[PDB]
Structure 1
Amino acid sequence: VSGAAAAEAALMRALYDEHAAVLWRYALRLTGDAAQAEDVVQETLLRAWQHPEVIGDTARPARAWLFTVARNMIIDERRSARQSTPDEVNAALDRLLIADALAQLSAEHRAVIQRIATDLGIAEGTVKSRLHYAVRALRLTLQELGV
């Protein structure tokens, strides 16, 4: 009947009231952190509910079984679990030159370098070349200025 599915609850709530507030302190001293201890306690008691082969023999210490569960979980966590952006001066000066050696170009070399042989409707050799000569013009201009 349903009284049994309620007996499960009334069995847990009857061990909580006697052992959770004490298990908490154990994990607290071992972690110095009441938040984790709060977590570890629920983890442990869930396992307890999941392992009824321990509480059945009421006459045997359950608390003693619980302490070891927690003590193990903490160390499981203690396994191998153990700025400012530069100033854009250079890059910007570099581009300020690159942009000054872009006006020294022809609109076709420009439209090509700003990107490919599928759009501009020309060969791949025309690409390779226009790229090639355009670069060399860029290199020439830059080194003309003394880069």
Structure 2
Amino acid sequence: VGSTDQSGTPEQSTPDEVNAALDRLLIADALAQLSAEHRAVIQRSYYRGWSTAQIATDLGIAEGTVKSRLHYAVRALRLTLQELGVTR
């Protein structure tokens, strides 16, 4: 049916990264106010996408230890964000 070189076809576009950049800045700020352990765990679960056992193997700690560190660090980031007025 169609050819991109032919007129009448809309060109593809990609949105700007403004919202993503602002969220990334706020997440970095909230991350700085965390302990080295909690930060090093959340940066290995969400930024590296490893499993629970993988982080437990890397950091040389227990399975439930990684679970509990993630469970608290998530809520600590939520505390910081809600203190700064981040929308739910």
Tell me the TM-score normalised to structure 1 length: 0.43
Greater helix share, structure number:
1
Q: Which structure has more RCO (C-alpha within 8 Å, separation ≥ 6)? A: 2
CA distance in 1, matches of 2:75, 2:19: 23
The CA deviation string for residues 40-84 of structure 1, in whole angstroms up to 9 with x for no partner, is: xxxxxxxxxxxxxxx9999xxxxxxxxxxxxxxxxxxxxx99911
State the partner residue of 2:79.
Answer: 140
- Quick one: percent identity of the two aligned structures? 92
CA distance in 1, matches of 2:61, 2:19: 36
Q: Is there any run of 5+ residues in structure 2 with no aligned partner, and where?
A: 44-53
CA RMSD of aligned residues (A): 9.7
Aligned residues: 72
Q: Which runs of 4+ in 1 moved over 2 A?
A: 55-58
Larger Rg: 1
**For the structure 1 residues 142 and 57, does the alpha-carbon distance in structure 2 shift closer, same or farther, using more than 3 Å as the test?**
closer
